[PDB]
Write a protein that binds this ligand. Structure first.
Ligand code: NZF
Length: 287
């Protein structure tokens, strides 16, 4: 049994809300450990269930246990909740807030304006997603937790239609997310909250490009050398200046020159107030 500390409080496996296996039902798959839609009884509470393969290393179990603790201590509306766990039956379950809208990247890619739906997304939708994730990032900075993989693929959406809310919902050399990392993270291997400020800038790019891979025509090592020598991505198609300027400020070479999330939020709001920003048309992808 390992312990875990966060916001000054310590907790162990035994502090997790163990839900009885008999109160949990799986309805269908979602993704590939492996995750299911399901529901919990007292009308049923609708949940996502992440499972632990019964064939797994002793390290995998420990990581699963630890992950359960880590998620359970977060208390913020823009971070996917832990409903509880079912550890005492096999296979073991972690129970999470069901996010009906899926991951942000996939969502963006399928909702890119086209001739059939020319005004499916507006700038304000993108600024609200940006805002939601920054607010979560601000929670993590306040509480001294460094995510290390703030990317579109690791953010989830409550629903697809309007009123959607986005939330940090996943943890995420060849596996390292090089395109989301600042210079000082390959160089010295050091991490601070200004790490996440950088990755957020990249997230911004992803949001305003409507789901493109960052640094389009570039491999990991190419991006490393490019970024290390002070090179940066261009503005995504139709991207307003004020929004791009937030990205370039997130990508300052000097950690100390990057804004904290309070300042990021302030600047995402200003953007949200500017009519030249919010009246800009998103590009239509030609189908
Ligand atoms: C991405 O796949 C889908 C996910 C969902 N919805 C969903 N809702 C809740 C959870 C969930 N998961 C699948 C992706 C991985 C995710 C997970 O394990 N998250 C870990 C986690 C959870 C909460 C917080 C957290 O910490 C932090 F915020 F720091 F990342 C880390 C669990 N997926 C829905 C879909 O269709 C609508 C999907 O496409 C088929």
């Amino acid at each position: 049994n390992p312990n875990y500390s966060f916001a000054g409080k310590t907790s162990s496996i035994s502090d997790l809300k163990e839900v009885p296996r008999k109160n949990i039902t799986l309805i269908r798959g979602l993704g590939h450990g492996e995750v299911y839609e399901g529901q919990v009884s007292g009308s049923p509470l609708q949940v996502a269930v992440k499972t632990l393969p019964e064939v797994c290393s002793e390290q995998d179990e420990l990581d699963f246990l630890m992950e359960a603790l880590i998620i359970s201590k977060f208390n913020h509306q823009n971070i996917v909740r832990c409903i509880g766990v079912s550890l005492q039956s096999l296979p073991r379950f972690i129970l999470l807030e069901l996010m009906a809208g899926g991951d942000l990247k996939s969502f963006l890619r399928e909702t890119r304006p086209r001739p059939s739906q020319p005004s499916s997304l507006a700038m304000l939708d993108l600024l609200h997603v940006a805002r939601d994730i920054a607010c979560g990032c601000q929670y993590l900075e306040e509480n001294h937790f460094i995510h290390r993989d703030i990317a579109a693929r690791n953010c989830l959406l409550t629903c697809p239609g309007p009123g959607r809310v986005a939330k940090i919902g996943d943890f995420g050399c060849a596996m390292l997310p090089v395109k989301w990392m600042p210079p000082e993270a390959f160089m010295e291997g050091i991490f601070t909250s200004k790490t996440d400020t950088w990755s957020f800038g990249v997230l911004l790019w992803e949001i305003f490009s409507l789901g493109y891979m960052p640094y389009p025509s570039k491999s990991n090592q190419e991006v490393l050398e490019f970024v290390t020598s002070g090179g940066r991505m261009d503005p995504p198609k139709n991207c307003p200046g004020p929004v791009y300027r937030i990205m370039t400020q997130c990508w300052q070479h000097q950690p100390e020159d990057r804004p904290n999330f309070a300042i990021i939020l302030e600047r995402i709001e200003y953007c949200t107030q500017d009519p030249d920003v919010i009246n800009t048309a998103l590009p239509i992808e030609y189908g």
